[PDB]
């Protein structure tokens, strides 16, 4: 259902936000920790113990989960279609 153009952006869209989350939480009253946090959500694997202590990452993490859920649900419909 999804062409290779989509998979070109999937591998970078998840990665680009990883450094951003490390940027927001650190400079408020690392890279490896955030990398396992975002990718694990997409694959639904409980990897790593890193947690969004800062409130900014939590609200961004909240909407981020919804981005993964639509991908899985929609793709299942296409295959069944």
């Amino acid at each position: 259902p999804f062409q290779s153009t989509l998979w070109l952006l999937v591998g970078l869209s998840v990665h680009v936000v990883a450094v951003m989350l490390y940027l927001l939480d650190r400079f408020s009253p690392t890279l490896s920790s955030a990398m396992w946090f975002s990718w694990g959500v997409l694959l639904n694997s409980g990897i790593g113990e890193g947690a969004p202590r800062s409130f900014s990452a939590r609200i961004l993490g909240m909407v981020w989960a919804g981005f993964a859920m639509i991908i899985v649900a929609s793709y299942t419909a296409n295959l069944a279609a």
Binding site: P29, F55, S56, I59, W64
Partner: peptide, 15 residues
């Protein structure tokens, strides 16, 4: 829409 969500709230946390 969520990209700038943290940027707006980032300033508000300082004060």
């Amino acid at each position: 829409a969520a990209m700038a969500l943290s940027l707006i709230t980032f300033i508000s946390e300082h004060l």
